């Protein structure tokens, strides 16, 4: 009666085998799901307020090293001299600074002026750039209320207002300067629910932070996540300190592996990016900027001292990042080095990529950096690299660098296949995916590396042009409404279809009290209306 | 040519079943393994050092 044994098992478990193989694929994706980028925001000296502005600036080889600001109450004359040994003096007086640090919109988030002035500029600027990045992702910030998304950030303390204190703004300084309050406040104002974490690994603090987010996004405690870092300095005490060891470049320009590599240069930086799982982002219809394949973080540990890193740790972290990403040195073709410009770290990094990349290369890999274009931005500097590569990968063009006289002699460039990317080059699609490497070596000892892959191929879709269409805009203030209207007018001066931009502004924006609507059927019609629109009603409902 | 096919199939099959079942429990252990504690140290006011 048990003769039913021959045919049965095959049909019985033809599904069991594929089920259990699918489970294996599930473990593979769980440990190694590529993560997706959908949001973007950056703020850098030289007037950089949008990522495309930065990309264009790098494209035109424009330096951004500025002069030391004086609005912070600095006794500049007491710090500038040719005496590098004089107490409390810096042999450098030129450096990139974000001059818009003091500017802020307190009313947008409903912030009283007393706490606003008492509040650390880092936090307000965090909130602004976070909102900008979230909008850039085309996601309604209001809809994020009650969601499980989390926030991760990286920043070190700076003691803004740590000196003389007035007896009026008391009660806000502790919340003003505490680092965790940054993420706490951004989540509170956004009404989120995911984990809120602030970290610190010196200049690498951004790069590690987003890496952490990846784990969370892989683990499943949040749908999307926010990452990035900001560094703005209120006291020049760093420069003079480094001026005591003469680590800075007297001209304030970091020569990335150049012949004249003789110092470093500091700058302020702002960067925020939205991270999301590839499958979830694909389902949600959000556009894909670029995909991460893996990450690695490790501490150098023992070394010749405390500040000097060991190249073997760099080799280990590069290999670990490549293995976790499942990539090989052949596939990648461009790596964003740290580009500190120090006479010590630069040769070590150079031979590190020599030993880890300059092998069995059928094509000579290209090396570039951004610090020759702007400088070092401390914690933000790391994430700054991610800002430009994704733009460079977007435009299919390799951006050049600056101050390239000839490569520093401390590197046997014959050993590897690397060469410095001193000239802008085309980086087009060819059917083979394009990959870019990012790295950061914090002075605290920890080092991090990131791997980026180009976004997949998405077919363009053609749509009919509607005869007539409304254009709507909402904001919290009338002047903000006018500025927005002028901005869409300026954008409309370019070549865009009216229907698509109308759909975008109606589907990728929130709704605010200040409202304005203009009906138009032609680009000229809408431009004229926007530049002439002056009647707006912030009414109350009945 | 294919008379005793199921006879070979059973042994072609059981090992695969148990192997990928071990993979199935591997996923659970990977995303759910308890973490042991091996050492603690503490310093608290009142002279507490251990």
């Amino acid at each position, epitope marked *: 009666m048990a003769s039913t044994d021959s045919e049965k098992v095959a049909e019985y478990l033809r599904r069991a085998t594929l089920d259990l193989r699918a489970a294996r694929q599930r473990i593979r994706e769980l440990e190694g799901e590529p993560i997706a980028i959908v949001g973007m925001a950056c703020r850098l000296p030289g007037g950089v307020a949008s990522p495309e502005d930065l990309w264009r600036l790098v494209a035109e080889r424009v330096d951004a090293v500025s002069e030391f600001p004086g609005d912070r109450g600095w006794d500049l004359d007491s710090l500038i001299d040719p005496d590098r040994e004089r107490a409390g003096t810096s042999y450098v007086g030129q450096g990139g600074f974000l001059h818009d640090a003091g500017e802020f919109d307190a009313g947008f988030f409903g912030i009283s002026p007393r706490e606003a002035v008492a509040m650390d500029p880092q936090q307000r600027l965090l909130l602004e750039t976070s909102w900008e990045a979230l909008e850039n992702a085309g996601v309604d910030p209001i809809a994020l209320k009650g969601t499980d998304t989390g926030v991760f950030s990286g920043l070190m303390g700076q003691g803004y207002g740590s000196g003389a204190v007035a007896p009026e703004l008391e009660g806000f300084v502790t919340t003003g300067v505490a680092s965790s309050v940054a993420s706490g406040r951004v989540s509170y104002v956004l009404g989120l629910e995911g984990p809120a974490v602030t970290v610190d690994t010196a200049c690498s603090s951004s790069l590690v932070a987003m890496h952490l987010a990846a784990q969370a996004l892989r683990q499943g405690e949040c749908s999307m996540a926010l990452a990035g870092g900001v560094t703005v300095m209120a006291t020049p005490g760093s420069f003079v300190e480094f001026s005591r060891q003469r680590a800075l470049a007297p001209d304030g320009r970091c020569k990335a592996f150049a012949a004249a590599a003789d110092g470093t240069g500091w700058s302020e930086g702002v960067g925020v990016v939205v991270l999301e799982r590839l499958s979830v982002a694909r389902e949600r219809g959000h556009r894909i900027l670029a995909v991460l394949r893996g990450s690695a973080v490790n501490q150098d540990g023992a070394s010749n001292g405390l500040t000097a890193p060991n190249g073997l740790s760099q080799q280990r972290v590069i290999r670990r990042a490549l293995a976790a990403a*499942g990539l090989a040195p052949s596939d990648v073709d461009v790596v964003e080095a740290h580009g500190t410009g120090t006479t010590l770290g630069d040769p070590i990094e150079a031979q590190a990529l020599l030993a880890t990349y300059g*092998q069995e290369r059928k094509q000579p890999l290209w090396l570039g950096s951004l610090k020759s274009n702007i400088g070092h931005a401390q914690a933000a500097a790391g994430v700054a690299g991610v800002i430009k590569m994704v733009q460079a990968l977007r435009h299919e063009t390799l951006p050049p660098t600056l101050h390239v006289d000839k490569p520093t002699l401390e590197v046997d460039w014959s050993a590897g296949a690397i060469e410095l990317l001193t000239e802008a080059r085309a980086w087009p699609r060819n059917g083979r995916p394009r990959r870019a490497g990012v790295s950061s070596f914090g002075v605290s000892g920890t080092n991090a590396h990131l791997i980026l892959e180009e976004a997949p191929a998405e077919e363009p879709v053609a749509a009919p042009e509607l005869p007539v269409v409304p254009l709507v805009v909402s904001a919290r203030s009338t002047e903000s409404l006018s500025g927005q209207a002028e901005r869409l007018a300026s954008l409309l001066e370019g070549d865009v279809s009216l229907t698509e931009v109308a759909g975008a502004l109606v589907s990728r924006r929130a709704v605010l009290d200040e409202r304005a609507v203009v009906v138009a059927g032609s680009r000229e019609e809408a431009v004229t209306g926007l530049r002439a629109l002056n009647t707006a009603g912030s009414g109350t409902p009945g | 040519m294919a008379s005793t*096919d199921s006879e*070979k199939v059973a042994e072609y099959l059981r*090992r695969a079943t148990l192997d990928l079942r071990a993979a199935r429990q591997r996923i659970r252990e990977l995303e759910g393994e308890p973490i042991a504690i091996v050492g603690m140290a503490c310093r608290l006011p009142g002279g507490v050092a251990s």
Partner: antibody
Amino acid sequence: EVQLVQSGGGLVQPGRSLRLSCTASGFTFGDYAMSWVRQAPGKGLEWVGFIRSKAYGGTTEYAASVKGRFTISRDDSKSIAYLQMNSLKTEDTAVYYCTRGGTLFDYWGQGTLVTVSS
Amino acid sequence: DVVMTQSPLSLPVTPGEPASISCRSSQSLLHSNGYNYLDWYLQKPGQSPQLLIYLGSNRASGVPDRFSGSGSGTDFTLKISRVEAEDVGVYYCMQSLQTPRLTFGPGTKVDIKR
């Protein structure tokens, strides 16, 4: 976990007979079907034979080159696979492995080198 | 009627580079039930043979994820995603449709590239 130990090898002279035992543990010994393979020094590996499970009658199968001289047997009570070699020649000097699975050679033992020389 | 198998004899590979070994056959191995009766065995020097891939597109435990198999009919390919120092050895591609199998064939020798 699953393991098995091979034993009973060593130097032997041509002509006589020997037996090789293999203790398998960590699984249902009687359900599976065991097999024996040989590997000559500096050559390929040759499938000696196998024994079916008691579900299929516990039949035996031997390579025709070594058939009639070697006999495999099972002790499911003690979970031991035995291979009795007889009338040994110098050509039989090789290593021998016992493996669970008649067709799939899932798990393999540590091996046992048997050398026949005058 | 017995189906023979063949492959490139030796393929030195630089470490950390994706490698592929192609196994051909004189006839299709796919059965009516819808399965290819093939497998791959590894053999480290001074080490017992080990099983990696069975019925073409399935990997056993212990074998790292980097290994994978593909192909059907008469052709098959074992792709090792990334090669470390302990992948040097001998690889055998065996069929399973016709039984018994006398030998594992010449195999393929995998060493370091220099």
